[PDB]
């Protein structure tokens, strides 16, 4: 089995204007995954924000593999006040077994600079 | 655009071999699964084969393992499926795709008729 | 190892109509579900994927339900363009599998 993913600050503080990173970190059983990285909606709804390899059916968002092959950065460009919210990132493993697993949440706070 | 255009479908005689390619475009190639999948004349489609983005990882229709190995060039954006061994039944048309979780990009398949 | 069966094969209707396919696994699959569009001699088209995921570029008219060994394609009210063969598909484990297809023709 492959455990699900780890992410990073629980909670991340920046100023309005800079970028802010999150580290999500997840180690595959094969080389079929995909990784997504999520805000909270209103109604406890996901919100897909970016993904690792992308939807090829599809900027501020972006996600850079580390070359530890297992670390993720999940970066807001710019952030803006109104990007203070709850993130958090789910791993999709295909193979051998279709399998859906979400870290837990942390919390992204952007201040009036 | 994402695209994919398969080649390499012909006739055979049984037990006889033919090898498949498959070009894809649009997209970074070794970042995604690809796959076959076929349709002989007149039924529905059947899974064939999946690898992995880099390659290490394969696998196959209960029906073809043994005969059938898909491969890729990573550095040419090109799948293969290497067919030995053919029988009557493998008569179809294969299309290669790409898995993201279903398959979202397909090829126009090519023909592939075995027969004496 | 997992086999789809589709009901019916064969579904006449008329344009307007609400159309109702549905999948039976033989065993639980989750969510990991797609459903397809194909015409003749054209490749298959993605509609749905994780059972209820309408894809993009697809018309809202497609809706797909279900979890566990029932799935359900809906068409809430049929097009000329929509008479095509429809098949479900499980990406659950391996082997794949396809159900064997539902053509969707004009009744008359």
């Known amino acids: 089995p492959w455990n699900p993913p780890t992410f990073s600050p629980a909670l991340l503080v920046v100023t309005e204007g800079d970028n802010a990173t999150f580290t999500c970190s997840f180690s595959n059983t094969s080389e079929s995954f995909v990784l997504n990285w999520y805000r909270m909606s209103p109604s406890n709804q996901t919100d897909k924000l970016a993904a690792f390899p992308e939807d090829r059916s599809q900027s501020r968002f972006r996600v850079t593999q580390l070359p530890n092959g297992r670390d993720f950065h999940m970066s807001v460009v710019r952030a803006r006040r109104n990007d203070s919210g709850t993130y958090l990132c789910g791993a999709i493993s295909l193979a051998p077994k279709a399998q859906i697993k979400e870290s837990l949440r942390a919390e992204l706070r952007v201040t009036e600079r | 655009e994402v695209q994919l255009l398969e080649s390499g479908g012909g006739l055979v005689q049984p037990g006889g071999s033919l090898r498949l390619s498959c070009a894809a475009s649009?997209?970074?190639?070794?970042?995604?699964?690809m796959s076959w999948v076929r349709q002989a004349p007149g039924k529905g489609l059947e899974w064939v084969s999946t690898?992995?983005?880099?390659?290490?990882?394969?696998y196959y229709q209960d029906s073809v393992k043994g005969r059938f190995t898909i491969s890729r060039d990573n550095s040419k954006n090109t799948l293969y499926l290497q067919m030995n061994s053919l029988r009557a039944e493998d008569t179809a048309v294969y299309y290669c795709?790409?898995?993201?979780?279903?398959?979202?990009?397909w090829g126009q398949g090519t023909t592939v008729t075995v027969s004496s | 190892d997992i086999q789809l069966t589709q009901s019916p094969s064969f579904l006449s209707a008329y344009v307007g109509d609400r159309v109702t396919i549905t999948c039976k696994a033989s065993?639980?699959?989750?969510?990991?579900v797609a459903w397809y569009q194909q015409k003749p001699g054209k490749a298959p088209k993605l509609l749905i994927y994780?059972?209820?995921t309408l894809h993009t570029g697809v018309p809202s008219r497609f809706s797909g339900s279900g979890s566990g060994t029932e799935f359900t394609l809906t068409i809430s009210s049929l097009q000329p363009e929509d008479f095509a063969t429809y098949y479900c598909?499980?990406?659950?484990?391996?082997?794949?599998?396809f159900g064997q297809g539902t053509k969707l023709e004009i009744k008359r």
């Open positions: 690898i992995s983005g880099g390659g290490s990882y394969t």
């Open positions: 649009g997209f970074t190639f070794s970042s995604y699964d």
């Open positions: 065993q639980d699959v989750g969510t990991a």
């Open positions: 598909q499980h990406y659950s484990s391996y082997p794949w599998t």
């Open positions: 795709a790409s898995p993201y979780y279903a398959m979202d990009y």
């Open positions: 994780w059972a209820s």
